[PDB]
């Protein structure tokens, strides 16, 4: 016989709501990337997105240890020659706090079209509310 | 340690409200409120506040001794108040008070006006002397530092705003 | 402010204090003695 493979048509996906208040950033993010990848399912398949849709709320109340709130630095580059930019953690939290979770998970996900498809299922919200009540999402504690 | 072991006796006319780590001390001069560190255990021994290291922490006696000397100062502030005196050394240097503002004339091309905070009341007996009173010690010291900062005293003549108690180490302009 | 690798007490009134990860000598008597390890 041959080893089973999941099929993207017959695969079922579920919805989960995670509250990110007070939780450690990376220890949250690796469980999110685990469940977006689908490595908690027996029908895991590397080339198939078998993960679950995840709504993350209270993203602005995520916690880091140490002095990383003032010392963790998010660099990027605009393409232009001087265009190195820089923002700290608490600046990113005040300015645009969803990016912190998005960046950590994007770094823990695979690189490619499938990893970008896994990232499309991550839906973060700074507040405590969402418009996705129509999908009947279950709660999940991480 | 030696500071934290000595309990702080609340006198009469001093109302004390314990709320978790939040401590409100009222009195005849005003109310003061301070949230302590979670490493500090505070308790009222029927005439005194005592200050112990809460377990599961590290800087126990350090935070306890800080919360001790703080609530001692909060008590003295709400039953006596603090009084910081400043004097002005220099020609043409003067001060005037308008309620909760101070109109300094410190040899600038522009008038200096300083708004007073909430629980701080000032008074000029003389033009070259400022006496300010209030409850919080950190605040009267902060306001006196700000008022000193306009004309920090010159070492060649002692000229400028000084504390009424500090010493001004002078310097001779040699040749 | 002298800024050195070697900061030392220069008089009886010098006091070595670590403010914000930096060894600093402060002297109430002589302002020349104030140092900063860097």
């Amino acid at each position: 016989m041959k080893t089973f493979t999941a099929k993207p048509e017959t695969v079922k996906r579920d919805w989960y709501v995670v509250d990110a208040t007070g939780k450690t950033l990376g220890r949250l993010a690796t469980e999110l990337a685990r469940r977006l990848r689908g490595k908690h399912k027996a029908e895991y398949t590397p080339h198939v997105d078998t993960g679950d849709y995840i709504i993350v709320l209270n993203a602005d109340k995520v916690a880091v240890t140490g002095n990383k709130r003032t010392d963790k630095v998010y660099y990027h580059h605009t393409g232009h020659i001087g265009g190195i930019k820089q923002a700290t953690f608490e600046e990113m939290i005040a300015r645009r706090p969803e990016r912190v979770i998005e960046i950590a998970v994007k770094g823990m996900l695979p690189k490619g079209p499938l990893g970008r498809a896994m990232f499309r299922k991550l839906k973060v919200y700074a507040g405590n509310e969402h418009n996705h009540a129509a999908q009947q999402p279950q709660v999940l504690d991480i | 340690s030696r500071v934290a072991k000595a309990p702080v006796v609340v006198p009469a006319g001093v109302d004390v409200k314990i709320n978790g780590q939040v401590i409100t001390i009222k009195g005849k001069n005003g109310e003061l409120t301070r949230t302590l560190n979670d490493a500090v255990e505070v308790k009222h021994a029927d005439n005194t506040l005592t200050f112990g290291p809460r377990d599961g922490y590290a800087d126990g006696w350090a935070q306890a001794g800080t919360a001790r000397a703080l609530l001692n100062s909060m008590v003295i502030g709400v039953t006596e108040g603090f009084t910081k005196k400043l004097q002005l050394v220099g020609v043409g240097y003067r001060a005037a008070v308008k309620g909760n503002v101070i109109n300094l004339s410190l040899g600038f091309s522009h008038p200096v006006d300083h708004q007073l905070p909430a629980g701080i009341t000032a008074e000029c007996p003389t033009q070259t002397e400022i006496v300010l009173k209030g409850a919080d010690k950190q605040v009267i010291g902060q306001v006196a530092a700000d008022l000193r900062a306009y004309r920090r005293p010159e070492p060649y003549k002692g000229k400028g705003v000084r504390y009424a108690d500090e010493v001004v180490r002078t310097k001779e302009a040699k040749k | 402010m002298k800024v050195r690798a070697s900061v030392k007490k220069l008089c009886r009134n010098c006091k070595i204090v670590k403010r914000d990860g930096v060894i600093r000598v402060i002297c109430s008597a002589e302002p020349k003695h104030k140092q900063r390890q860097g």
């Binding site: 393409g79 232009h80 020659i81 265009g83 | - | -």
Partner: protein, 209 residues
């Protein structure tokens, strides 16, 4: 503060009594009429949408004419939109005259500049010409070098090169307003505004004062 939509009529001069000639730019400002009021509950921000002038009725389209008919207002040659300050509001069919600028002193004029077409780096970026003699082979107005040798095999972004010059939105700031003639719908500003003669202008009160 909101602005008004006018049109560049031309330039002239105002002789003062003192013997000073003030070069002014005549901006006729017809009645800007509002067509839509945008708010926080529907649109997320507070602004108005105005129209001015007239337009041929056979040429104005049914979507556009329904948009003017809902406000109940005569069409115009365009639709512009001005963000509202606080404590400031307007109705829908309201007409706005140039008397709004009756007590302003400086304005910022936004217009579309003249089209220079495809311009070289001498004209566009004010590069120096090379030597017109002393041996120059076919390289009199060229840009010269554009990079460096192998370290970044590549030209950097935003390198100043030739291309389209003009025909773009520019804003001239802090123009002293001279005269406000509400009767013939004019606005005389000191100096030269962008745009050719007969083009639309956006006159807003000066933010830098």
């Amino acid at each position: 503060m909101i602005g008004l939509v006018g049109k560049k009529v031309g330039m002239t001069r105002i002789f003062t009594e003192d013997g000073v000639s003030i070069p002014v730019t005549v901006i006729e400002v017809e009645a800007n009429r509002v067509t839509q009021v945008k708010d926080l509950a529907n649109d997320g921000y507070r602004a108005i949408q105005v129209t001015t002038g007239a337009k041929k009725a056979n040429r104005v389209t049914k979507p556009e004419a329904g948009h003017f008919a809902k406000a109940g207002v005569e069409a115009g040659r365009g639709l512009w939109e001005f963000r509202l300050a606080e404590g400031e509001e307007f109705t829908v069919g309201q007409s706005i005259s140039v008397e709004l600028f009756a007590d302003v002193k400086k304005v910022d004029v936004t217009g579309t500049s003249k089209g220079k077409g495809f311009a070289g780096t001498v004209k566009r970026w004010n590069f120096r010409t090379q030597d017109a003699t002393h041996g120059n082979s076919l390289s009199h107005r060229v840009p010269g070098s554009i990079g460096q040798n192998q370290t970044p095999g590549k030209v950097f972004k935003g390198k100043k090169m030739a291309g389209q010059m003009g025909n773009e939105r520019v804003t001239v700031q802090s123009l002293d307003v001279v005269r406000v003639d509400a009767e013939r719908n004019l606005l005389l500003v000191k100096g030269a505004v962008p745009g050719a003669t007969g083009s639309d202008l956006i006159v807003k009160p000066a933010v830098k004062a």
